[PDB]
Design an enzyme around this catalytic site. Structure first.
Site, PDB file in Angstrom:
ATOM      1  N   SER A   1      -2.462  10.125  -7.151  1.00 43.36           N
ATOM      2  CA  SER A   1      -3.726  10.371  -7.839  1.00 43.36           C
ATOM      3  C   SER A   1      -4.686  11.625  -7.047  1.00 43.36           C
ATOM      4  O   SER A   1      -4.699  11.667  -5.893  1.00 43.36           O
ATOM      5  CB  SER A   1      -4.647   9.271  -7.888  1.00 43.36           C
ATOM      6  OG  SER A   1      -5.981   9.358  -8.541  1.00 43.36           O
TER       7      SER A   1
ATOM      8  N   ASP B   1       7.485  -6.641 -13.881  1.00 43.42           N
ATOM      9  CA  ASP B   1       6.893  -6.187 -12.513  1.00 43.42           C
ATOM     10  C   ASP B   1       7.478  -4.668 -12.101  1.00 43.42           C
ATOM     11  O   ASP B   1       8.536  -4.792 -11.538  1.00 43.42           O
ATOM     12  CB  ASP B   1       7.143  -7.281 -11.490  1.00 43.42           C
ATOM     13  CG  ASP B   1       6.544  -6.975 -10.267  1.00 43.42           C
ATOM     14  OD1 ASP B   1       5.891  -6.109  -9.989  1.00 43.42           O
ATOM     15  OD2 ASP B   1       6.954  -7.615  -9.218  1.00 43.42           O
TER      16      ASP B   1
END
Length: 330
Positions: free
Chosen positions: A199, A35
């Site tokens: 992004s 994770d």
């Protein structure tokens, strides 16, 4: 040193991925959920409330000659999906795909919430976010990667998740045969303890690319792709009959649909998520309403590039003095 381990979807939907981890001496192999959005290595154990164990493999520290109780240490964690676990702490030898850390904090669960009990395939978590998020008290503990880092050939790990298929976590090296083209690297902020990056935009299907900054985290422990409501609405508008369902808890779509791809930007580079990756199947057995793999992050407080996004790429988690993230197509 290096390590390399195969990671395997837990079910036919790729709801999560498990990776075998050796703990203790002799080894006890548990299948852990790696994770990158948390920083605790915790396991089902011989100390876990019996009624809260349902098919998981447990760690029994008393059977490990290298286990030592970390005196006074406790831990307690709550995850974004509302699940939780807590307990006490041992140090022990932990190996992943041939890479061994001695003295790793192994957090032994005394209590786990129902979603963990109900998932027989996940024996615990191995956190790979920054150690500043680790919940051990009163002395915070380091992640497996943090402990291994100095010994690694290169201070990196890579995630290569499969779509409906196994994939690979590598530590300490970049497998140049595992991706196409070049890896594009992008800046990381560690301020919230995550692999947080920005992004450069998105496209829906064959549509034009929209240049827009989307701050989010690379999170292997989250199944879906959670993005701003504007972006998500633009995606689902291209699927006839798709709608946001408050009763279901997100966007659903007719199972008869063909889903468009979704592209996200990494610098000047582009990662394409095929439409099929965005299908999470019937909302309930036999239903013709299917759950979407792209959902709104509104009310999460952060955008999450979860498995839906990450499995479309070869992803480098670069833990150099100034961390960065790399993405390549594959």
């Amino acid at each position: 040193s290096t390590g390399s381990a195969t990671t395997t979807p837990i079910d036919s939907l790729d709801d999560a991925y498990i990776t075998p981890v050796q703990i203790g001496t002799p080894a006890q192999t548990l299948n852990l959920d790696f994770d990158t959005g948390s920083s605790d290595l915790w396991v089902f154990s011989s100390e876990t409330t019996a009624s809260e164990v349902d098919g998981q493999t447990i760690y029994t520290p008393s059977k490990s000659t290298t286990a030592k109780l970390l005196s006074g240490a406790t831990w307690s964690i709550s995850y974004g999906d509302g699940s939780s676990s807590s307990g006490d702490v041992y140090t022990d030898t932990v190996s992943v795909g041939g890479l061994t850390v001695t003295g790793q904090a192994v957090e032994s669960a005394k209590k786990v919430s129902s979603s963990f009990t109900e998932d027989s395939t996940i024996d615990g978590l191995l956190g790979l976010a920054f150690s500043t998020l680790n919940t051990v008290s009163p002395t915070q503990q380091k992640t497996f990667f943090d402990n291994a880092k100095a010994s690694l050939d290169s201070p990196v790990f890579t995630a290569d998740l499969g779509y409906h298929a196994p994939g690979t976590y590598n530590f300490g090296f970049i497998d140049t045969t595992a991706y196409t083209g070049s890896i594009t690297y992008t800046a990381v902020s560690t301020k919230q303890g995550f692999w947080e990056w920005t992004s450069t935009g998105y496209a829906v299907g064959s549509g034009t690319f929209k240049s827009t900054s989307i701050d989010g985290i690379a999170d292997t422990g989250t199944t879906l792709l959670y993005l701003p409501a504007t972006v998500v609405s633009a995606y689902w508008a291209q699927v006839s009959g798709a709608k946001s369902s408050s009763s279901v808890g997100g966007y659903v779509f007719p199972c008869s649909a063909t889903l468009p791809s979704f592209t996200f930007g990494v610098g000047s580079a582009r990662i394409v998520i095929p439409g099929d990756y965005i299908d999470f199947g019937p909302i309930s057995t036999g239903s013709s309403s299917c759950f979407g793999g792209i959902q709104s992050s509104a009310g999460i407080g952060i955008n999450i590039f979860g498995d839906v996004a990450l499995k479309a790429a070869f992803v480098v988690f670069n833990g150099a003095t100034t961390p960065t993230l790399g993405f390549a197509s594959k």
